[PDB]
Amino acid sequence: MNTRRQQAQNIRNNAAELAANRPHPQHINNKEEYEYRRPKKDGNEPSHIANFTKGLPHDEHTGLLLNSADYDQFVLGIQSGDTTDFARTPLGPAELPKVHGCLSKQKIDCDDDHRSGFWKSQIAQGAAGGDGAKLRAWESAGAGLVFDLEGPDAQAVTMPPAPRLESPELTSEIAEVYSQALLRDIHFSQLRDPGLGDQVNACDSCPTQLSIYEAIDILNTVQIEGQNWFSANCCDLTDDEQARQRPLVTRQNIFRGIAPGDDVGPYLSQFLLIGNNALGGGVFGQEAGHIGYGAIRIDQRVRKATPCKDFMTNFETWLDVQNGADLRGLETYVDADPGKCREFPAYRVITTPRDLATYVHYDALYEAYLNACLILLGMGAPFDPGIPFGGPQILTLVCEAATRGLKAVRFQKFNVHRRLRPEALGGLVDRYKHGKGAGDELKPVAALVEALENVGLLSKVVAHNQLQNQNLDRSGDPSSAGDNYFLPMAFPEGSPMHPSYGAGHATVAGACVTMLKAFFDHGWQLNLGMANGKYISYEPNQDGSSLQQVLLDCPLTVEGELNKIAANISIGRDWAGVHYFTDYIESLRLGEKIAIGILEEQKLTYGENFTMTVPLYDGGSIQI
Amino acid sequence: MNTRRQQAQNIRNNAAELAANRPHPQHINNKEEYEYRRPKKDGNEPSHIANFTKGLPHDEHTGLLLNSADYDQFVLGIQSGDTTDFARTPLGPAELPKVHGCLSKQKIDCDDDHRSGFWKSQIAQGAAGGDGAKLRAWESAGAGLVFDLEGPDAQAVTMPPAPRLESPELTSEIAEVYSQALLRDIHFSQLRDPGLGDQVNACDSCPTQLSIYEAIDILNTVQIEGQNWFSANCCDLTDDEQARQRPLVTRQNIFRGIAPGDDVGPYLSQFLLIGNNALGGGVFGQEAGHIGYGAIRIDQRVRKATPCKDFMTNFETWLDVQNGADLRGLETYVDADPGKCREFPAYRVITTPRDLATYVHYDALYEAYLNACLILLGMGAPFDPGIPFGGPQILTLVCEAATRGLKAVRFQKFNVHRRLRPEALGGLVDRYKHGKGAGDELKPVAALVEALENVGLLSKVVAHNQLQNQNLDRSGDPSSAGDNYFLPMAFPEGSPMHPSYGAGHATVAGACVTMLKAFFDHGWQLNLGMANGKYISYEPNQDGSSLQQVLLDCPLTVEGELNKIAANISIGRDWAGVHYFTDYIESLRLGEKIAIGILEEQKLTYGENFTMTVPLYDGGSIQI
Amino acid sequence: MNTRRQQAQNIRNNAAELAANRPHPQHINNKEEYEYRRPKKDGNEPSHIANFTKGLPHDEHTGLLLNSADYDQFVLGIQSGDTTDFARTPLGPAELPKVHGCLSKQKIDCDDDHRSGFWKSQIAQGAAGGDGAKLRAWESAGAGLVFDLEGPDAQAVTMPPAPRLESPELTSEIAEVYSQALLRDIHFSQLRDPGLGDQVNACDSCPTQLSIYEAIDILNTVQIEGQNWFSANCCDLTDDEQARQRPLVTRQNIFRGIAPGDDVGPYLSQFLLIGNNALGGGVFGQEAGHIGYGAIRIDQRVRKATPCKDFMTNFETWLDVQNGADLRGLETYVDADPGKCREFPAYRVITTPRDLATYVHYDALYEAYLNACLILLGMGAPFDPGIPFGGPQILTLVCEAATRGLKAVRFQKFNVHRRLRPEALGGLVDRYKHGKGAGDELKPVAALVEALENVGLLSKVVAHNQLQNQNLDRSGDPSSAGDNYFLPMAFPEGSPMHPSYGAGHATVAGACVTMLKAFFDHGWQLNLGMANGKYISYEPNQDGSSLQQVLLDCPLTVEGELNKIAANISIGRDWAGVHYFTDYIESLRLGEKIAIGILEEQKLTYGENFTMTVPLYDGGSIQI
Amino acid sequence: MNTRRQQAQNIRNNAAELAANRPHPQHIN
């Protein structure tokens, strides 16, 4: 009827119109940015305590935002597209200017080959070959202002307002992240019900301040104005809050996501542990952890970071990282055992949250979800019956969604919300407890720390930190002697150089597994064998030499493990100490909208009518 | 000036118009389809000897296309979008109908649990658990009729007419593929100049009919009407043929591509051998072959197929595969050595073309080019200076191009050219030599076989095949006693169920590495260390225990190794015996046009003006 | 200003744009389709137990879906528009194929004049004049893919996900439908509070297993995981579920709708009982049941089906109907009494739910709502004061909406949800209780049957069925001896040949009465006379000779009775045993959106501005 | 090829054009 040229152009115009006709939601945040004030001479200015200020100049003595004008230049640079204005923003340690209003541009470092003198912490000042740590800029400050050829636009979708410093929800979330830091070397067998099987401890025992039972107690009894987040009924919560509300914390659901299948079985998804049978006749099984990646394979053993070595446990170390000290690659890892094969224990199966924190430290965006795809393909997992059936589509399509997710979430990070990272909050706690801050600056975090103290959690982290500060890399720091309430960090550099709300990993996670659940038969039961009339499931044995079976009543499904791995990687960041729970759940849902939109638009490219049912994280299954 | 909604829609409309305004070339093939005739009663019909007829009914005795009506129904189903008409096409063994003109629909198998009786070869009739081999349909018969949201349309780009059975070019290409089959277990050290370093033989020595020197002789002296393809000057060749013409065959350039960097150094690209240094402090180096895939790793050891075991070496085996016998997964692989680590020798570094043929047998489209990306990222390879700089874009963007390439090439495979696979040609040679075919049916391949016989190559393959037919899986087949001129095949099933011209691997290869060369600094020199004032490069040692250094005067570049790996995977199919050289070179260029087009369209999504220079396979560097 | 031609075309273009600019919701179902699995050899497949499989081949012994491939072909035919693919689907009894994956196409009947041998039940095999029952195809498989000139498109509106087999809601709904089957011959006086007036029993007394009081008990105490549907608070229910949640079950609200006016007065709407006064001077009154249909009249007496004769009470009968046995018109009806006028008792006023089930068995879509219109017109009911005022518009406009409703709901039936009919669920209960189903196939309905057994309801239906199987038409069936937990059916053929969710009657009901409430003065009080200071209302006397007055404190309104008749016809299907409650309430709301949309579009056709207020079923009154 | 929304609107536009393109007779008494 019409030429190929016209059809191809029309289909691309119709996908553009489809995208534009979708509802465009209005971007709303929690008002905290300009609400919380601090006294200046003859008036008051915004504190920006609840904001992402990492990289901007912080005061060396008080550890707070040095000049509010820096934040204004930072924001103005983000809100406009102008990189020249954004470059005017000071970065790292800075001198306060003589006249108020002027930028504290006085950048202490610029073209400086030696810069040890500017950093306050031994780690930072001696790090970069003795020259002193370098600065690091804000990664992708204007990625949310980039368009795309497919999927919904970065601003055509959104996330709800984040929790507030006053809120019960936020108090439980920071308590959860604090707890995870103290449970960071717990063996993953512990993160389930003992009824499923025998549990063990990590081979490397360390001075633990907190146990799994205590964390369940603290998370259940922590409260603001006599209200616990998990215990509060629906009437007191807004519609946004009702959706992401969680039940009473238990062994089975602690530190887990709330999508279908997360509560079932072990904490770690099978796809982070198992592999495929060897190509052709088997030399090994799925227990070995070799993914059938073509005719070669992928080792499912993550590199082992030295157990029980946290970072940013004192004021000096924390401050330098907050002033953009580049401390990447200063983590220490365990050496290999000459006698053992497979570089053990330098590489071991993900055994503790530290190992998962290490995984998500260097993972390549879609890695976990591509690897899952390969495992399912190697197992002979069936595709959606509604789709007329190869792997080539799904293998590429799981990658495609990742970048579209990042653009959407970058807008939410920098342009919309600009939520502070858990480190920054951990700082406010410490800084508040040492009577710092001008006048009424830190009054908003009073309610927070009182609740965290009333459950005895701050006593634990101070006890944790004093042991952590006995290490020689930070023992010489002035603040190591006194009490420290900072959040123990898995990485020396801490969080990436971008805002907390809208998680990059969870947005990518949400977008990727949604594609996997769409293509594959989500109901398909992964049969990893049977044992004594019960279905076989794996989790790491102690020390990470191999896997250890757990026997379940019902077998694990495709959607369940795909939902669980999404949580593992997203929540893995929380274990590392760089995200709150809201960053996972709401970003999960954001990436879902991106993935669905791309599938809806690619629907037009086929000359036939088919349909692929894709399960939602909220219990339904939308049809595309 | 205007809302975000409108801009996003406009940019997608402008990318659609940009795509439509690009020149749309007309699709032209080599006329062979309806040219070559065979006698029927009271007239003549098309033979379709030069066409892809795999799956359609072949005659059990003569081994040729049984009924030309089947091919007409096959074509009509492809050329229209109608799957109902395409399903009418018979598939596998069939009975010839009583009235001429009618389809040989008489499908021998349909709902048959036992189907051993229909297959002529012991392998096929006893394969599927003793029930007999199953049929396999034509993979993606209408994938070339699917549109896309980005890049040029599947029909908005094309490839030139393929070589003809009469041509000098085709005679050299089949001679090249025959030679590769006989050199399939040669050690990769042999495929370069001895001046570069010491060469070795494979640990598993086998009765070789052909040597490397003889192959160079045969390929240089093979000729049709006194003209060698490599020796012919430009005046006798058409503009299409001049572009893909190669020089005199030598040790350094034999079985290699003609892009920049292919001639330099070892045959295998570094990216198929080396890995990264271990994350953090090194437990191993790049020589180990562990790619830094996040915090885990990728083993660069391919699974070892039993050396010197080829397939389809007699008439019975060949015929059944040509009648769509599903013989996938019937290859045998070597067991592991209990004493050795790393499942050696069940998995070894790609040591012989057999190992590369195994790699490309099961590789996941973009695997080799994603793995290369990861290696470059781990090495700290710099990006294009013109681009304002993460990995997230390039990591996703290398995958994105793959599916767009497949749609373009599927149209070229099924809709445009429909070239016969090298197996089918190998059949025509055998079938011609046994005086089969009605009247003047096989006269077109006379010139071919005379030239292949005059260089003494057919004497070699008959000598190869008689040794291959001594194996017990095929010794009981009737044709094993007599002479066989069939092409030895690496896989039991042989080629995929789709036409030869337009290679899937090479199109994907061409599209992927073009993206990698675009993003990365193509000029960057990979420094894998120095030794005695010369630059270190690796190739597999004998038996594949580890790598073996080769010292070069100049160091290897990013573009060179990216171009070499593109050839390795594409030409790897030729080693397996499923593609000619033209399938590589022209598909390489097709994928390049796809990749460039996608980059040109994604150029609009950025609110700023930048540029990324991307090197071409033909010597220039286009700017996008 | 412009010609009549242009205006007419513009108004039709503006109504098209208005329709397109309305919000287009995304279609989401309850995920059950591919979730519930059953074991096949070397893996697992979808059971499709929760899906509509009526017509597809069911296994003769186990009574479950024979081949999952049949369902895939069924779905693929629906999801595409291709009738050729849909015709490939097998229908009725079938042979299972020798090779797995292949369709169980092996259709047992095709061109068969005698087909008694294929059916398992005496009714079916001897039905069609002794030749044996015929097949029946799926009615309107692609009606949801048809557009319209007015109102919203079939896919431009939707319904929420249906209840699940695990859910408390579904357990109460099936318990409600089971109860209705056992109360099917109860006198309609019983379905209200005794305070309103004297109640009576049906003249034809039958062995009742259940009473009205027991049904109220069972429906109130039935529960899953200790939660009753009616007793559950809002926090445990999703927003969809909160809307359609009902209060504690009582005499007044049992088996009734939840729109305004449903709870008031007798169960049956006045419009199904009363007529008009005779034209001119009265020979009769409104009590006679003669509607003033022009100068003739409509008899309000439905044909009396033999009391207490249910169908599909054993396995044989149920199975044949599930295999598409055409058993329409095999119901028996009562003969007339020669002495009595008006063909009594062969025709009587709707006295029992059986009579309402008979009404909705053969009613002509809009009949009940057209008849209501005529009654209101004859009574001199006033139109909406906002409308500038004949009957011609409303008389036609009530019909207009019906077809638009059917197209919308057909899409929801076949394309979106594909929910199983109550018969199919009743089957799963029986089939589960006899230990049928492979492995873990019927585990999802375990929770269901345990709850239904714990309230003693299954004891009742087995007691009901054994008495029902004493009839000679089914006593010779093998399964009549043993226990049967099947749902007693009012019709021999059972439900229509289309999915359960999205009711045809309720969608049409919702669309029609919405038009009637829009045009008429919804507040107008129907004054059927007064008696002793109280307002007269009618309900059937015992035996159905005439009507019986009930005296109410307040008089009945137009909207109330129009809402009650909507429930009567919709819920009348539930009494017949072919729909759940969700099918009524959500379809009611679907038809409302259709009716409102048509009125909004026809609003443009008038050159003047007026408005008509139309009451909603959810308490408000939208203005158009 | 195109979304359900567009088709539904097009079909209603084509029925409007069909109606307008029919011959319009002149009214004579």
Q: Is the peptide bond before A345 cis (omega within 30 degrees of 0)?
A: yes
Question: Which one is catalytic: A48, A417, A464, A505?
Answer: A505
With 0-12 / 13-18 / 19 or more C-beta atoms within 10 angstroms meaning exposed / middle / buried, residue D26 is: exposed
Residues in chain B: 624
Closest CA to A485 of A131, A209, A96: A209
Amino acid in the structure at residue C508: V
Q: Which chain A residue shows the shortest CA-CA distance from B306?
A: A280
Closest CA to A401 of B365, B396, B146: B396
Distance of CA B158 to the CA centre of its chain: 18
How many whole angstroms separate alpha carbon B440 and alpha carbon A480?
95
Q: How far is CA A245 from CA A241, A256, C235, in A?
A: 6, 13, 11
Q: Give the closest of A21, A234, A622 to C26, CB-based.
A: A622
Alpha carbon dihedral C475, C478, C481, C487, in 10-degree steps, equals -80
Q: Give the closest of A521, A609, A620 to C30, CB-based.
A: A620
Could D5 and A14 be called an inter-chain contact, meaning their C-beta atoms sit closer than 8 Å? no
Token couple for D2:
């195109």
Q: Give the closest of D1, D3, D5 to A607, CB-based.
A: D1
How many whole angstroms separate alpha carbon C525 and alpha carbon C506?
25
**Is A495 in contact with A421 (CB distance < 8 Å)?**
yes
Neighbours of chain A (3+ CB pairs under 8 A): B, C, D
Chain A residues with CB-CB distance to C75 below 8 A = 385-386
Closest CA to B342 of A347, A368, A548, A355: A347
Could C98 and B112 be called an inter-chain contact, meaning their C-beta atoms sit closer than 8 Å? yes
Within 8 A by CB and 6+ apart from B461, the residues are B178, B181, B182, B209, B484, B485, B486, B487, B488
To the query of whether residue A498 is one of the catalytic residues in this protein, the response is yes
Q: Which residues does A contribute to its contact with C (CB < 8 Å)? A: 21, 23, 233-235, 380, 384-386, 388, 521-525, 527, 554, 608-611, 613, 615-616, 619-623
Could C29 and A623 be called an inter-chain contact, meaning their C-beta atoms sit closer than 8 Å? yes
Tally Cβ neighbours within 10 Å of residue A508: 31
- Looking at the DSSP bridge assignments, the partners of residue A613 are A623
Amino acid in the structure at residue B86: F
B541 CA: distance to closest CA in chain A (Å): 18
Radius of gyration over every alpha carbon of chain B, rounded to an integer in angstroms: 25
Could D9 and C17 be called an inter-chain contact, meaning their C-beta atoms sit closer than 8 Å? yes
Question: How would DSSP label each residue in A61-75?
Answer: TT-SBS-HHHHHHHH
Token couple for A255:
């530190």
Q: Which residues of A248-274 are buried (b: 16+ CB within 10 A; e: fewer)?
A: ebebbbbbbbbbbbbbbbbbbbbbbbb
Q: Catalytic residues of C, which ones?
A: 498, 505
C153 CA: distance to closest CA in chain D (Å): 7
Chain C residues with CB-CB distance to B113 below 8 A = 98-99
Q: What angle do CA B413, C102, B98 make, to 5 degrees?
A: 70
Token couple for A269:
């998804």
B296, B299, B309, B568: best to mutate for the A interface, most A CBs within 10 A? B296
How many beta-carbon pairs under 8 angstroms link A with B?
Answer: 243
Chain A residues with CB-CB distance to B393 below 8 A = 403
Could D13 and C16 be called an inter-chain contact, meaning their C-beta atoms sit closer than 8 Å? yes
How many beta-carbon pairs under 8 angstroms link C with D?
Answer: 47
**Is C526 in contact with C606 (CB distance < 8 Å)?**
no
How many whole angstroms separate alpha carbon B437 and alpha carbon B443?
9
How many whole angstroms separate alpha carbon C180 and alpha carbon C356?
12
Collapsing DSSP to helix, strand or coil, B123 comes out as helix
Neighbours of chain B (3+ CB pairs under 8 A): A, C
Q: Which chain C residue shows the shortest CA-CA distance from A527?
A: C43
Q: Which helix (H) or strand (E) holds A378?
A: helix A367-379
C6 CA: distance to closest CA in chain D (Å): 8
Q: Give the closest of D7, D15, D17 to C149, CB-based.
A: D15
Q: Which helix (H) or strand (E) holds C298?
A: strand C298-299
Collapsing DSSP to helix, strand or coil, A622 comes out as strand
Collapsing DSSP to helix, strand or coil, A285 comes out as coil
A98 CA: distance to closest CA in chain B (Å): 35
Q: Give the closest of C15, C16, C153 to D4, CB-based.
A: C153
**Is A200 in contact with A541 (CB distance < 8 Å)?**
yes
Chain B residues with CB-CB distance to C97 below 8 A = 111
Chain B residues with CB-CB distance to A606 below 8 A = 146-147
Could A613 and C31 be called an inter-chain contact, meaning their C-beta atoms sit closer than 8 Å? yes
Q: Give the closest of A21, A611, A615 to C31, CB-based.
A: A615
How many whole angstroms separate alpha carbon A448 and alpha carbon A173?
11
Could A619 and C238 be called an inter-chain contact, meaning their C-beta atoms sit closer than 8 Å? yes
Q: Which parts of C151-192 are beta strand (E)?
A: none
How many whole angstroms separate alpha carbon D24 and alpha carbon B455?
84
Q: Which residues does C contribute to its contact with B (CB < 8 Å)? A: 84, 97-99, 102
Report all structural domains of chain C as residue ranges with CATH numbers, in order of start: 1-624 (1.10.606.10)
Token couple for C555:
């008089």
Could D1 and A7 be called an inter-chain contact, meaning their C-beta atoms sit closer than 8 Å? yes
Number of continuous H segments (helices) and E segments (strands) in chain C:
18, 16
Q: How far is CA A502 from CA A409, A418, A426, A589, B541, in A?
A: 5, 9, 19, 10, 49
**Is C121 in contact with C474 (CB distance < 8 Å)?**
yes
Q: Which helix (H) or strand (E) holds C39?
A: strand C37-40
With 0-12 / 13-18 / 19 or more C-beta atoms within 10 angstroms meaning exposed / middle / buried, residue C170 is: buried
Collapsing DSSP to helix, strand or coil, B302 comes out as strand
**Is C237 in contact with C508 (CB distance < 8 Å)?**
no
A17, A22, A605, A610: best to mutate for the D interface, most D CBs within 10 A? A17
Experimental determination technique: X-ray
Q: Which helix (H) or strand (E) holds A423?
A: helix A422-433
How many whole angstroms separate alpha carbon A211 and alpha carbon B411?
62
How many whole angstroms separate alpha carbon C78 and alpha carbon A610?
9
Q: Which chain B residue shows the shortest CA-CA distance from A9?
A: B16
Chain A residues with CB-CB distance to C161 below 8 A = 620
Q: Which parts of C228-329 are beta strand (E)?
A: 290-291, 298-299, 301-303, 325-326
Token couple for A82:
């102008």
Token couple for A107:
């950048």
Closest CA to C34 of A394, A517, A524, A599: A524
**Is C119 in contact with C320 (CB distance < 8 Å)?**
yes
How many whole angstroms separate alpha carbon B50 and alpha carbon B48?
5
**Is B212 in contact with B353 (CB distance < 8 Å)?**
no
Amino acid in the structure at residue A22: R
Chain B residues with CB-CB distance to A139 below 8 A = 390
A384, A524, A624: best to mutate for the C interface, most C CBs within 10 A? A524
Chain C residues with CB-CB distance to D8 below 8 A = 16, 19-20, 147-148, 153, 156
Q: Which residues does D contribute to its contact with C (CB < 8 Å)? A: 4-9, 11-13, 15-17, 19-20, 24
Question: Which one is catalytic: B48, B498, B522, B579?
Answer: B498
Could A605 and B147 be called an inter-chain contact, meaning their C-beta atoms sit closer than 8 Å? yes
Q: Which chain C residue shows the shortest CA-CA distance from B87?
A: C85
Chain B residues with CB-CB distance to A24 below 8 A = 5
